[PDB]
From a paper:
[name] is a hypothetic sliding clamp family protein; it is coded by the [name] gene that is highly conserved in ASFV strains. The crystal structures were determined at atomic resolution and confirmed that [name] can assemble into a homotrimeric ring-shaped structure. Different from homologous protein structures, [name] has a very unique amino acid sequence and conformation at the IDCL, J-loop, and P-loop regions, which are involved in partner recognition by PCNAs. Although the detailed molecular basis remains to be investigated, [name] has a high dsDNA-binding affinity and can enhance the catalytic activity of the AsfvLIG protein, which plays critical roles in both DNA replication and DNA repair pathways of ASFV.
Residue numbers in the entry:
A (entry chain A), B (entry chain A), C (entry chain A): 0 to 3, 16 to 297
The structure:
């Protein structure tokens, strides 16, 4: 094609009125395939067995829970922010994560494009196409998919991440993926639980654990503006919850996105919002 | 000496009429010692036990087979393309690969020169000298070698790589070491055998495997010019062979050279030619 | 603060007349925390169980021996070469290395400052504070320390590294940490002991081992000026000792400093002096 390395001249067309191929129930193309690799490293870290996929004319969404059933994951890729998107209607698919694990891990910088196709022809087949433009090499995966495991709680977890319900969480801040990784990797060296504490007002955010007669650790954020922290905790009121380290380390080590928004409420539930390009990743740990 | 790091001022003299030292049956010197490290990483990947060495007044050749006896390796370093070469006559040596494994792995960028000396004085000793010019440090290895294991098939494998016999292979193309590594690493994630298929004419090269009800994988090269593919397969004739992944991954992971020429024939035999600087590496898998 | 990354504007004030906080028996601050990480990688490589710490109004010193009891380590950080130092008197502390192992390993480039505080308030607590200036994040470790294990030989090992006793060692040279690592890693591939030999006069330094009928290895330094070698061995006199590889590889792999001074005497005792910035590291292997 056009090479200097191949110069990537891709157009972000978004949602199309009709597919290129007539039997396509879904046509997806994206110029950032590493998004899918990091997403499924996250699914691997969570030891998720099955990935629920919902395709609508506007976006595709991947649902999953971790093995310990504590964390819920909702990853939606917006069709208007990708290079090519069409979906005929609302249909669902089920993918075994172990089957596609190595396929997603095979994504490297030699692939400038990922294509996903589902056809009425093969109702139990999902096509994944990775394209190497340096040598015009097309790598096509034929993945056998099933009709979805119902999991009716997804109707309640998609409501839990609504913006009406989100702007009432009293404590929120932002970490880079590097910062979230460092905090919860260092914490995992000594503890499985960490206390998150914040006094009402302009006091620092505190993360700490205490072990008598050996080691106590306290990490304190003395400038709330530098982590985009906002708090609605009443003055002279103490916000204090304990959260598990394991699932947060799984998301942090996956490095799925650039920045990560952390939202906390008083009964211990956290929400992690990791938005990058076309991918909006939400983690609900209850 | 002359340093800015030491400025390497080495001369490629080639073959000499007589050695520097009088008792030298073989004097070899080369300014690219990493060639030998990658060559013996390959020998290690193949689990080769013994390396057969033939020294002639024109070149030195290393023979070996893999543990499964499927692959044959012929690596010859041309005396006219190295910095210093002399050999009195045609003689053979045998090296235990396990004995010299760590020695070759010790080669790094601090060594700007490898020297190999065999003397009539010590008929069962092979000298390997690595020189660090930053501190004038000379690292000398005294390796005990044996008289060679006969292996008479080498007379038939050196004939098999003749250019008369090579230009009749109907299917050939070229991969970079990175491309050959990616193809056969990704293949090894799901299969032990891959089908190589090519229809006569200007059709794409196809590599694929099929597993019912789980995963099928197909990688297709839509531009034969971009992989230097040439085919003599008759029009409307189908070339189709199955090849083992393991031994090819061993060569690809060794990253011995820059480019790799792949030659296929209809009964499944492959030949890999990897030529870099003074080293010509041939892999015959039958 | 002042950011372009945060521009580090730290002052090296040295020793202060009185602490900032009134109850501080020791106040230590340093703008090179990676020194402590490499120091405790060394302590980990030696499998040291307990670290003896002596704090004086002029400097802080860390003592330890390796598990095999062959090597002694004396690491002193000079208070006049750090950013902030005060100590009320001469007192001693004991630290369990396993307890603080992960804490020191958590030091990365996101921390521009390490602070160590001991208070009369908490006599069995040592505070370690790492500061991330990008987000004003303060990571405080509360380490439980004990009153020191007496180990009276430290009075004899601190005398052994006196400059009066050091300038009589007949053989000394200097390696970069990369060179010391390469020599004793390559040696560890084939041997547990290496012979160090030097003939009196301007002859090369020799390091070698010999194994009959398999492999002999000889590394020779043909330019003594390039490794800053000085010898007081009488002419036509042979200096020859055998030294263990393990403990030297532990120091070399730790990469604690830039250069390393090696001192040898005729009864096999070695001394390694590794001085970097505020840290002076001495290794005595008897």
């Amino acid at each position: 094609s056009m090479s200097e390395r191949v110069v990537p001249n891709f157009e972000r067309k978004g949602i199309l009125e009709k597919p290129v191929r007539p039997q396509s129930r879904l046509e997806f193309s994206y110029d950032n395939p590493l998004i899918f690799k990091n997403l499924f490293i996250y699914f691997k870290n969570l030891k998720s067995k099955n990935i629920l996929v919902r395709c609508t004319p506007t976006e595709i969404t991947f649902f999953s829970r971790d093995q310990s059933q504590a964390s819920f994951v909702i990853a939606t890729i917006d069709g208007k922010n990708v290079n090519h998107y069409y979906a005929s209607d609302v249909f669902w698919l089920g993918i075994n994560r172990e089957l596609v694990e190595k396929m997603f891990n095979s994504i490297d910088r030699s692939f400038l494009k990922i294509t996903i196709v589902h056809r009425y022809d093969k109702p139990e087949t999902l096509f994944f196409i990775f394209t190497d433009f340096d040598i015009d090499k097309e790598c096509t995966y034929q993945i056998t998919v099933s009709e979805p495991e119902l999991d009716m709680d997804l109707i309640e977890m998609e409501k839990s991440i609504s913006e009406e319900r989100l702007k009432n969480y009293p404590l929120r801040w932002e970490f880079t993926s590097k910062q979230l990784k460092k905090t919860f990797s260092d914490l995992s060296n000594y503890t499985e639980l960490v206390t998150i504490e914040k006094l009402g007002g302009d006091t620092p955010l505190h993360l700490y654990f205490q072990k008598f007669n050996s080691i106590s650790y306290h990490e304190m954020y003395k400038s709330s503006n530098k982590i985009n922290l906002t708090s609605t905790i009443p003055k002279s009121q103490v916000f204090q919850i304990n959260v598990k380290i394991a699932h947060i380390k799984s998301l942090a080590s996956a490095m799925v996105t650039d920045k990560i928004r952390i939202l906390c409420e008083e009964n211990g539930n956290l929400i992690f919002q990791s938005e990058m390009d076309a991918l909006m990743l939400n983690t609900i740990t209850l």
